[model samples]
Target: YDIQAWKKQCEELLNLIFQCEDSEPFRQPVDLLEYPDYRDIIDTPMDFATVRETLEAGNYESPMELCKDVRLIFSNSKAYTPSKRSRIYSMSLRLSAFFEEHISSVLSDYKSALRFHKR
Candidate 1:
């Protein structure tokens, strides 16, 4: 049961998100100058850039920990945008679905690997 393998999968998961056009806004921190009140509205701001940096820096303890940040990115976006119909909101939803589907598979793969290693 090597965590390194899972970390690699997490990187690929993140890269897929990086390649997504809908992920544009979530790739980096929100521009504080444009939305000065963003910090006030969102208690914990998360972005793909931060997630990737943390992963590269070897700060995440588990795949689910990294997944939490990915979820946070979308949750923060939906919370701040304040409109279900807004393009940003919809983009967040789309990205969320993509991430959820892929991450579930990633987790399943990790579990299968662990099961194999146990034998």
Candidate 2:
């Protein structure tokens, strides 16, 4: 199982997302002072840092598992931000769109990697 290659690719994609200027709000955990109800609202609050931590620990069983948490970062932001016009909300929307566009290729690469290994 060329899973190692898939994970490396995942890390690279995640790092690229992290470096995005619009990704600043998602790079770390939300400050309770800014959004005191955040913890109360988000059942499984996730951030880029936590996802990186999980990736470093090799905790993901599949690419989708990692994808879930990454998606959650944006989803949670959208859920909590009341105004659609808010910069935070737009940032999440933009980042979400960016991630979805690339992740499909990553999944395809995983499929090809496994097929290659089976040869």
Each model's lDDT: 0.88, 0.86
Worst 10 residues of 2 by lDDT: 1-10
Distance from true location, Cα of 21 in model 1, Å? 0.5
The clash count for each model shown is 0, 0
Pairs in clash, predicted candidate 2: none
lDDT by residue (1-119, candidate 1, tens digit) is 56457799989988899999999998999999999999999999889999999999999987878988888998899889968899988999999999998899677777777778888
Error of 1 at 54 (Å): 0.2
Candidate 2 wrongly placed segments (more than 4 Å)? 112-119
TM-scores, all candidates, are 0.89, 0.88
Cα lDDT, model 2, residue 106: 77
Write one digit per residue (lDDT tens) for candidate 2, span 13-101. Answer: 88899889888999999988988888888888888999989989979877778889998998898889889999998989999999999
